[PDB]
Amino acid sequence: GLKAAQKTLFPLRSIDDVVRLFAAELGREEPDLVLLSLVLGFVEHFLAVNRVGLTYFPVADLSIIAALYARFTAQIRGAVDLSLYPREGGVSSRELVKKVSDVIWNSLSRSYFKDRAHIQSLFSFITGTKLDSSGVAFAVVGACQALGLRDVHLALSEDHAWVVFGPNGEQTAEVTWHGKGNEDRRGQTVNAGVAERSWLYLKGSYMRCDRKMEVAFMVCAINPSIDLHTDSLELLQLQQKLLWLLYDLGHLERYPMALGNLADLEELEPTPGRPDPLTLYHKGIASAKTYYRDEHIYPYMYLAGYHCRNRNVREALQAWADMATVIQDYNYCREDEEIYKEFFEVANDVIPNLLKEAASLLEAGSQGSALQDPECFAHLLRFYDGICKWEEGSPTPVLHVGWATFLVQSLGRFEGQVRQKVRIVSVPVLTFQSEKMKGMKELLVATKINSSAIKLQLTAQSQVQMK
């Protein structure tokens, strides 16, 4: 049962009408996740997946949306008999959460590409029987709301989603898959992953959503992609307007990644009278420092990316150095491969390209070049230091010889006279945390870097060729 007050804005005839619906729901005791996800999925389908016939905006008629809502609530209420799972004290049981997870899981198409765009929403679940990884977690939370289970909430790391529930909201349960070819842990807590200090569980400093943050998640989950070359302007506008709505109400306060998304949108198409992208990226970092012990990587990656795109080399290097300063206190574990790929691409592709362009510009007489700034060299060294310290104590190594040629090249982009200015001190001035960089210190100021010795010190390799 949609309530009478939920129906009065239909039909939705524009972006702004969708925004009004979100504003109305966010003003309610609890925003209706099912309704809002169905609307977003409907509007995304007809703006990104199939634009045949589009003349302005795909009008969302109440009859259509209500029929979709009824399919969802019918399935869930039919398959989950709450009488089998008595609720001690206004809180849900692990068995109940697992049952809801199973109902969503078991509904899905037997075989489909899980990496497709536009399979995030309950519209996808209902019309295509398809969901992406995190979409399954959202759908479990939407189903639990539909069942009246006020204590079940979405939990988010930077690369995974699960639920919290139970007495004081203190229980965790896996409800979806992560990655590819990992083994399902649905029903289990996340405690092993927290205890092993993996990036995937953020040492426990992950997001525990309220209902409003769950709305923010579905908005971040909007995918404006039409194809590899084209985005939907309509969906970008919608996402941007919804994020500002949430921002103004306070619901992005504890959501760094949403703040960075909003900053990226503002760079693309600034809203008059709003904060600059940089202000927003800094707010994201502040959010991570305030609520999550400064244990998140992506607030710094968002900032660095902005600086990189705008060829602020100094500030890009500083932000990637900061990114490494966070990662150093993690152990690199089996399902952390996405953050490995991000650091690998920065070290072995992005930074080299940036420094190569800097080198051409210096040849053409640029002033205040990062390549002549010793604090820029210090940032490069701190980036590598953090990666090396990350590797310390980890169950799987990080560095290999495929990193070493890029390190030598990048070091060599700074002339010896620049490199000499950095003073490396023990516990521009820099202090290394990692044993690998401490051993590398003397190699760092020679006019021509000793490539071979660098390679030996960065990697496990301890011998040179026999012959």
Partner: peptide, 10 residues
């Protein structure tokens, strides 16, 4: 393609 909601980059 698929990326985790609000992950930076592409």
């Amino acid at each position: 393609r698929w990326r985790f909601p609000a992950r930076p980059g592409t």
